[PDB]
Write a protein that binds this ligand. Structure first.
Ligand SMILES: *[B@@-]1(O)O[C@H](CNS(=O)(=O)c2ccc([N+](=O)[O-])cc2)c2ccccc21
Ligand SMILES: [Cl-]
Ligand SMILES: [Cl-]
Ligand code: NA
Ligand code: NA
Ligand code: NA
Length: 262
């Protein structure tokens, strides 16, 4: 609709920032796109690709997910809600994946990154899936600086929506691994104020949020609307001021705009 485009442009104008949206509606294989080829700092939405890389690795390495990883004081970073409870013990790669995806734990993300060989390995995994846009450059916490004009640790809404479709609804991962990713995302604890806040209460969502510098506020989701084919929605938002506050309401508003009528 021209109307949906006008509404997204009006939302962006009023928000004061830069908004990126990609909706894929699998009912009819249609898309709604807004700045969908521009780059945005992913922040913690990048944790989906890191967990998926570990899941892919596990397809050839049974018991990979049970492998123990030491958590040390030296591993702590700036947001460690789960890992701080396990200092001086180990967590399994499954537990680290769940902590990264469901609590957005940054130690957990760093362990996923390290396990697969670092940010360039996460990026190479994206390339193997056919995503030639995603780039993970840094580890936690520096990957969240979100400086305007900086391509590090960015992707586009179109690419992330297409890749998330592949990961959650398509065949990027084996059936067990795909189901595990979906189960983890459906159990996310951090997304109630973002895409979920713009959808009817009855709809089921698996999502991963991200927040960072420049008031960057993001969410990527697979959505099961009541009695409808699933949707994929990416909403990325960033602001001009280094210390801008988060704007999860902008993501909720974008979600409402693009799903009105469904
Ligand atoms: B990354 O973007 O995710 C974590 C946590 N982000 S957060 O903004 O601190 C947050 C948002 C929402 C919730 N919630 O439960 O609703 C909890 C935390 C992170 C931290 C630091 C840097 C990057 C990321
Ligand atoms: Cl409702
Ligand atoms: Cl977040
Ligand atoms: Na980023
Ligand atoms: Na991407
Ligand atoms: Na959400």
């Amino acid at each position: 609709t021209a109307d949906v485009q006008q509404k997204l442009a009006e939302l962006e104008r009023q928000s004061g920032g830069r908004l990126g949206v990609a909706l894929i509606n699998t009912a009819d294989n249609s898309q709604i796109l807004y700045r969908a080829d521009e780059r945005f700092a992913m922040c913690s939405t990048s944790k989906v690709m890191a967990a998926a890389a570990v899941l892919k690795k596990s397809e050839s390495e049974p018991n990979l997910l049970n492998q123990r990883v030491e958590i040390k004081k030296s591993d702590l970073v700036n947001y460690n809600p789960i890992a701080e409870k396990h200092v001086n013990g180990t967590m399994s790669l499954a537990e680290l994946s769940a902590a990264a995806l469901q609590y957005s734990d940054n130690v957990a993300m760093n362990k996923l990154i390290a396990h697969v060989g670092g940010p360039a390995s996460v990026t190479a995994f994206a390339r193997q899936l056919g995503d030639e846009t995603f780039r993970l450059d840094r580890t936690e916490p520096t990957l969240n600086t979100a400086i305007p004009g900086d391509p590090r640790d960015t992707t586009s809404p179109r690419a992330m929506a297409q890749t998330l479709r592949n990961l959650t609804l398509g065949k990027a991962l084996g059936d067990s691994q795909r189901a595990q990713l979906v189960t983890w995302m459906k159990g996310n604890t951090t997304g109630a104020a973002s895409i979920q806040a713009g959808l009817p209460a009855s709809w089921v969502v698996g999502d991963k949020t991200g927040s960072g510098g420049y008031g960057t506020t993001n969410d990527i989701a697979v959505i099961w609307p009541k009695d409808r084919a699933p949707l994929i929605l990416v909403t990325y938002f960033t602001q001009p001021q280094p210390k801008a506050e988060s704007r999860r309401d902008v993501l909720a508003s974008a979600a409402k705009i693009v799903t009105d009528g469904l």
